[PDB]
Amino acid sequence: ELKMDQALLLIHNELLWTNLTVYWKSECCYHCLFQVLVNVPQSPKAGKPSAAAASVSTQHGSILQLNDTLEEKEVCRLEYRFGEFGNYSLLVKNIHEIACDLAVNEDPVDSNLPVSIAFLIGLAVIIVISFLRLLLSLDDFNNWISKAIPPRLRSVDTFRGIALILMVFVNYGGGKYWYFKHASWNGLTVADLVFPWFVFIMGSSIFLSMTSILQRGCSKFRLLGKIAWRSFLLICIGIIIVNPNYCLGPLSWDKVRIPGVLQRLGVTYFVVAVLELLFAKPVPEHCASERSCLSLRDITSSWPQWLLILVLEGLWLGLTFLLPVPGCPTGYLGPGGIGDFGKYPNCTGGAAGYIDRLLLGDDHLYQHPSSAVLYHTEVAYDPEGILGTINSIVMAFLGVQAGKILLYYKARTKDILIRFTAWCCILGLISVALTKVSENEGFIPVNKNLWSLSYVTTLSSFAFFILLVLYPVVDVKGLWTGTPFFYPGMNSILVYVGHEVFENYFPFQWKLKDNQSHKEHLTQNIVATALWVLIAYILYRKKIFWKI
Amino acid sequence: AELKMDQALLLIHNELLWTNLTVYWKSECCYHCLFQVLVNVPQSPKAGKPSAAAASVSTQHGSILQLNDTLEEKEVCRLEYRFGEFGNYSLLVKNIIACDLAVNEDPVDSNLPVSIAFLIGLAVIIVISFLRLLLSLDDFNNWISKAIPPRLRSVDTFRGIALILMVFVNYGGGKYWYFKHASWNGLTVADLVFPWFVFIMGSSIFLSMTSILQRGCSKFRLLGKIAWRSFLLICIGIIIVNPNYCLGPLSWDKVRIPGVLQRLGVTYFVVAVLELLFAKPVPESCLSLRDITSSWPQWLLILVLEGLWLGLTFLLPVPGCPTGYLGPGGIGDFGKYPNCTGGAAGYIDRLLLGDDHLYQHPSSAVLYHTEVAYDPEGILGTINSIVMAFLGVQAGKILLYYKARTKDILIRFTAWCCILGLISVALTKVSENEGFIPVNKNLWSLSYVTTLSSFAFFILLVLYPVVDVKGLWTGTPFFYPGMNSILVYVGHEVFENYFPFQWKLKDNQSHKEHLTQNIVATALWVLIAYILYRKKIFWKI
Numbered sequence A: 001e002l003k004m005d006q007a008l009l010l011i012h013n014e015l016l017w018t019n020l021t022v023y024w025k026s027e028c029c030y031h032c033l034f035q036v037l038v039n040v041p042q043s044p045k046a047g048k049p050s051a052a053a054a055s056v057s058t059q060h061g062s063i064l065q066l067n068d069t070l071e072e073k074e075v076c077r078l079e080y081r082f083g084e085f086g087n088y089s090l091l092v093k094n095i096h097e098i099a100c101d102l103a104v105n106e107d108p109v110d111s112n113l114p115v116s117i118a119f120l121i122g123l124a125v126i127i128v129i130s131f132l133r134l135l136l137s138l139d140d141f142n143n144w145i146s147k148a149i150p151p152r153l154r155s156v157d158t159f160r161g162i163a164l165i166l167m168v169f170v171n172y173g174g175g176k177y178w179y180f181k182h183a184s185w186n187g188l189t190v191a192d193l194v195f196p197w198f199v200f201i202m203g204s205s206i207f208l209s210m211t212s213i214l215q216r217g218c219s220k221f222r223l224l225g226k227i228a229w230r231s232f233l234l235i236c237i238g239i240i241i242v243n244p245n246y247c248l249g250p251l252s253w254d255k256v257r258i259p260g261v262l263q264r265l266g267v268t269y270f271v272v273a274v275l276e277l278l279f280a281k282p283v284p285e286h287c288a289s290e291r292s293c294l295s296l297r298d299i300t301s302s303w304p305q306w307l308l309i310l311v312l313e314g315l316w317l318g319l320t321f322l323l324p325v326p327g328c329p330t331g332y333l334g335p336g337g338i339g340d341f342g343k344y345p346n347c348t349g350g351a352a353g354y355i356d357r358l359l360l361g362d363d364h365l366y367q368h369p370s371s372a373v374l375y376h377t378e379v380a381y382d383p384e385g386i387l388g389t390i391n392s393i394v395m396a397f398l399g400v401q402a403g404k405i406l407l408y409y410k411a412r413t414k415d416i417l418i419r420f421t422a423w424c425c426i427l428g429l430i431s432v433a434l435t436k437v438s439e440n441e442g443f444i445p446v447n448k449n450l451w452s453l454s455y456v457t458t459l460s461s462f463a464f465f466i467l468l469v470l471y472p473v474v475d476v477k478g479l480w481t482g483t484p485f486f487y488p489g490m491n492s493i494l495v496y497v498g499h500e501v502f503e504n505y506f507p508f509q510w511k512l513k514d515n516q517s518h519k520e521h522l523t524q525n526i527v528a529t530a531l532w533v534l535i536a537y538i539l540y541r542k543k544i545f546w547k548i
Numbered sequence B: 001a002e003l004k005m006d007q008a009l010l011l012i013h014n015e016l017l018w019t020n021l022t023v024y025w026k027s028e029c030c031y032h033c034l035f036q037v038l039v040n041v042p043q044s045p046k047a048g049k050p051s052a053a054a055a056s057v058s059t060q061h062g063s064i065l066q067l068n069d070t071l072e073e074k075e076v077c078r079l080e081y082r083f084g085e086f087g088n089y090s091l092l093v094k095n096i097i098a099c100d101l102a103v104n105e106d107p108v109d110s111n112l113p114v115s116i117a118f119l120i121g122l123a124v125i126i127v128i129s130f131l132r133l134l135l136s137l138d139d140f141n142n143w144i145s146k147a148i149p150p151r152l153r154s155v156d157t158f159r160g161i162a163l164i165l166m167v168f169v170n171y172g173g174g175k176y177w178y179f180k181h182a183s184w185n186g187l188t189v190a191d192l193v194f195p196w197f198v199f200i201m202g203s204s205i206f207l208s209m210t211s212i213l214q215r216g217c218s219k220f221r222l223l224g225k226i227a228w229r230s231f232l233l234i235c236i237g238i239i240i241v242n243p244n245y246c247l248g249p250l251s252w253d254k255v256r257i258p259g260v261l262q263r264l265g266v267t268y269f270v271v272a273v274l275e276l277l278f279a280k281p282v283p284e285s286c287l288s289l290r291d292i293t294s295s296w297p298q299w300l301l302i303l304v305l306e307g308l309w310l311g312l313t314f315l316l317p318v319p320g321c322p323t324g325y326l327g328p329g330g331i332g333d334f335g336k337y338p339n340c341t342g343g344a345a346g347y348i349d350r351l352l353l354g355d356d357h358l359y360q361h362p363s364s365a366v367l368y369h370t371e372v373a374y375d376p377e378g379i380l381g382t383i384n385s386i387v388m389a390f391l392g393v394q395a396g397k398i399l400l401y402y403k404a405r406t407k408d409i410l411i412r413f414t415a416w417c418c419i420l421g422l423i424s425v426a427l428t429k430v431s432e433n434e435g436f437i438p439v440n441k442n443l444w445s446l447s448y449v450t451t452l453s454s455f456a457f458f459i460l461l462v463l464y465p466v467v468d469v470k471g472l473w474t475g476t477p478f479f480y481p482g483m484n485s486i487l488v489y490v491g492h493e494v495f496e497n498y499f500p501f502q503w504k505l506k507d508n509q510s511h512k513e514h515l516t517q518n519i520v521a522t523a524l525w526v527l528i529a530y531i532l533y534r535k536k537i538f539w540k541i
């Protein structure tokens, strides 16, 4: 009857001489049009109101505006938040103006109230018990037959493993929860964090591997060849394997999505690694005093790259806020569709979307952006577009900066911690200035689809804080080893390609008894993520590390 | 036009007034099929204006048309014609009743120009493109620099031939009928790879077992390795290879338990454990026959297993079905056994695994219109798969016992090939549908096993001197997949739909485009195997 995250709204219209139409919009919309929910006829006679049934969305908030069909006047307005499976009744009547009362016939399922952390810890206990029993069964079976007859940081690795586990969880569905999906246009969800963290970690590893290779006595040209080959392979693997849905049919060139996650990673890797190789200064030595020296030797040594990154960021800001888009406001950052009151429907992405549609074409972009379900956008927008690559490069260079911090001051963790704290604080201040700590307001609101500058600064401050926490615990104090996380940290590309390839396979996806149940989807996605962690751990035990 | 691939437009118009015509169709290859209706041709309203009809007749191989008056059910005429692909034929029936079937436009051969010189042209194109890709990329790098126990290889070649053929026929084989699995009885090019794979698996079982045991390894560690490999093969087949995940998520009550890799694992376990249990060191000749008497317990057990297969096939009473039924069911055998596909083997696997846990689209479903699910890699045929794996083990025994006696190996290979060919001739009477046990991949018939074993022994007889002794030709396109068989199979199952192997065609009703796509995909899989060989990334177990 009712789908997932969808209540039932019964609308009894007791008025005699007024047609009734009901409009609905979410509270997550910034400026959305009022979609038609249902049209309720007038009551044929007193005491027998006419009723119409509507299925309202539950995920986040709801606004109801009831208007007459004849005169189009506001009868009454509602801002109720509905439950996942409810039988709400909306009675409109003339008590005198007209007073409408909303009644909850059946109480909500109250999603996230029942599962809480109790269900999650129970599922973890169950899977741990099953894994232990499976491990112990091998010994009993064997006995029965026998009776008859530089080193890796591991903080970067734990960070990458956290990102990979979260990415596998949110990519497989994340329980089909709205906060485990990418945000529609603006704001930040759990699924919007992993990709910037992946780019940040990629930049950090770029600096780490490049400086290790250069200090081992390697030529710059061979390293450039390796960088070019890796970027080319990333782009090709993305385009051929990761982007297309091969269950829909054979891959035609006219409908090939050129941009993608791996294409963005390859392009940014090439750009920032080539910048690092062009300006590659050896890691110098400190004063060996530990007396709060606070030397800015890890920024002035890279001012080449800082100047070029600032030029690229200025280019991104100019192309975003200044490039004229035909039939579209200059400097448009909205989602289009019904967003911004539906006056710019074919404007999803503004300048970034325009540049993507111009250079690559509509057919070669992402056909189903995140805004399509909330703002009802019809144009194809690619989150990993062309303008966003500039900010992807900027964040990869911030990750390179983190690697420079943790390599220049490798001797003392005090300097590393202060550098990480200062960078996190500065990036957080920049993000607060840009977005005014607001989801949809601010100069540049946080936006994964546009890869906003505030998106980059917010997620970079998050990654710097994550490093500030993980580096002492995992490395200096050694209190933790990233115990379940670092195996994906070592087999990141294998995990990504595998879960993009084996997404529909049985251990990661099976048929559920109820597909509208959040609990079943969450159980399946958690099991699949745990199985990918298990696969990464098994490969780690076998010393198998696929590297490009 | 509206003509699908392998179809001809048949325009039937009758210049007659006082009879209604219904046209029946029956492909020539089917053994005993009911005449399925094709089209109903009504009376012409008046003389001089025949009433026309349209029908798309299959042109894969032959066609028999039964035109009988639907009012009285008497055949006005019956003609057997080999229609051409994309043809346009006018079956004119009128009083003199005479049927002629004139030709309106010429058909398309679809096989001669596509495989006479098109194959050479495509091979030239692919080798030129590969050379250009390998050279131009390296040309830029060279220009920039200026500015700045051993494997036999005949078994490997045989396995690579089987893998190339399997990749070609699984991907479609150009959608040609002779590159698909035969509808029930008979042999096609696609019906040879799996028995060859089982034969090679048995030969490799013996070679690996002898090497491991002569190296001093214990029998229990080897038994654990056997069990682990069989379990892994079964699990891979069940989880990765069998399901079509493009349809939807996997449910237990709709999962195909049998399969290619499951059967390979079961036969590997049985044959390898038999060899390990009755394991003897190879001794150290013109007329010795020692490699047959040494494995007399295994031969006795294989004879008992074959007798059990014969007894279950020809004596097990299947309810609602004739005993010893080797036919395909459906409209085959005059449609008197509509649900009898496989007979005893189908009954056994339906009773033990259920209709849901079988292959829901048997190869006979298109020709004989069978409605039951029959699994070619079922339960009863696993006995014959074990037998053919043991024949492969015998080939490995021949290879290893007479290692230094090439003439002895050749004599043994030709003797086994001739003996198994004689058995196949006796069982089939050289006939696809006649004989005591006709050749059948779906049933994995005993004569199927013996025919493919004689073929494999002849292949080995031709390959052993050339690739090993005389060194005339290493399996230079073939051993590269031969040493990565499991990777090639699993990858081509997983990446079947991916771009290098599949892309959207200009028209899917074209044998030329499909053949080009499948040959390109097979060549790309050979190239992937060669790349893995060059980097030594042989995946095993």
Ligand SMILES: CC(=O)SCCNC(=O)CCNC(=O)[C@H](O)C(C)(C)COP(=O)(O)OP(=O)(O)OC[C@H]1O[C@@H](n2cnc3c(N)ncnc32)[C@H](O)[C@@H]1OP(=O)(O)O
Pocket (backbone or CB within 6 Å): A151, A152, A153, A154, A155, A156, A157, A160, A166, A167, A170, A171, A191, A192, A194, A195, A198, A199, A201, A202, A203, A205, A206, A208, A209, A213, A261, A265, A489, A490, A492, A493, A496, A547, A548
């Ligand atoms: C939005 C969603 O929900 S889905 C979006 C998902 N986004 C993604 O980016 C997922 C896919 N991406 C990835 O998996 C990764 O970003 C990758 C594989 C592309 C890049 O991984 P990277 O972080 O660049 O590191 P990778 O493991 O490939 O190794 C690169 C180099 O860094 C080195 N390195 C890695 N970790 C460390 C470490 N902790 N310390 C030192 N060196 C390290 C490696 O040794 C290697 O150098 P080498 O080749 O000279 O030996």
Ligand SMILES: CC(=O)SCCNC(=O)CCNC(=O)[C@H](O)C(C)(C)COP(=O)(O)OP(=O)(O)OC[C@H]1O[C@@H](n2cnc3c(N)ncnc32)[C@H](O)[C@@H]1OP(=O)(O)O
Pocket (backbone or CB within 6 Å): B149, B150, B151, B152, B153, B154, B155, B156, B159, B166, B169, B170, B190, B191, B193, B194, B197, B198, B200, B201, B202, B204, B205, B207, B208, B209, B211, B212, B260, B261, B264, B482, B483, B484, B485, B486, B487, B489, B540, B541
């Ligand atoms: C019907 C259709 O169109 S599709 C159906 C066809 N598909 C199939 O049959 C599935 C694909 N099959 C296969 O890939 C293979 O048959 C397999 C991998 C499943 C079977 O493995 P095998 O054929 O025995 O070969 P594999 O390469 O795995 O060799 C296994 C052992 O034999 C040894 N071996 C293999 N070839 C040789 C050789 N030429 N000389 C010596 N030893 C050899 C290996 O060393 C290994 O022993 P080890 O563990 O001691 O090292």
Ligand SMILES: *[C@@H]1O[C@H](CO)[C@@H](O[C@@H]2O[C@H](CO)[C@@H](O)[C@H](O)[C@H]2NC(C)=O)[C@H](O)[C@H]1NC(C)=O
Pocket (backbone or CB within 6 Å): A023, A034, A065, A066, A067, A072, A073, A074
């Ligand atoms: C529902 O009715 C209200 C009230 O009549 C509408 O809001 C006002 O009226 C016009 C449209 O008639 C709006 O454009 C104005 O912005 C509102 N204020 C004033 C002062 O007019 C509302 O637009 C109606 N909703 C729909 C979907 O028709």
Ligand SMILES: *[C@@H]1O[C@H](CO)[C@@H](O)[C@H](O)[C@H]1NC(C)=O
Pocket (backbone or CB within 6 Å): A017, A018, A019, A041, A042, A069, A070
């Ligand atoms: C209400 O809607 C009905 C449509 O069924 C229409 O016939 C009627 O005239 C409407 N009444 C008013 C007051 O608009």
Ligand SMILES: *[C@@H]1O[C@H](CO)[C@@H](O)[C@H](O)[C@H]1NC(C)=O
Pocket (backbone or CB within 6 Å): A001, A008, A087, A105, A106
């Ligand atoms: C909702 O409640 C009304 C009365 O309270 C009842 O008639 C109706 O069947 C209920 N609907 C559902 C889906 O439970």
Ligand SMILES: *[C@@H]1O[C@H](CO)[C@@H](O)[C@H](O)[C@H]1NC(C)=O
Pocket (backbone or CB within 6 Å): B018, B019, B020, B042, B043, B071
């Ligand atoms: C042939 O069929 C047509 C319509 O189906 C019918 O009108 C006619 O009477 C039939 N002729 C004979 C001889 O049955």
Ligand SMILES: *[C@@H]1O[C@H](CO)[C@@H](O)[C@H](O)[C@H]1NC(C)=O
Pocket (backbone or CB within 6 Å): B024, B034, B035, B036, B066, B067, B068, B069, B073, B074, B075
């Ligand atoms: C067509 O009619 C003839 C008349 O003898 C009959 O023998 C034949 O079986 C018919 N074809 C069918 C029923 O398919």
Ligand SMILES: *[C@@H]1O[C@H](CO)[C@@H](O)[C@H](O)[C@H]1NC(C)=O
Pocket (backbone or CB within 6 Å): B001, B009, B011, B088, B089, B104, B105
């Ligand atoms: C087949 O030939 C006839 C000749 O009368 C013609 O009318 C018909 O259009 C042809 N069919 C096609 C598909 O061209």
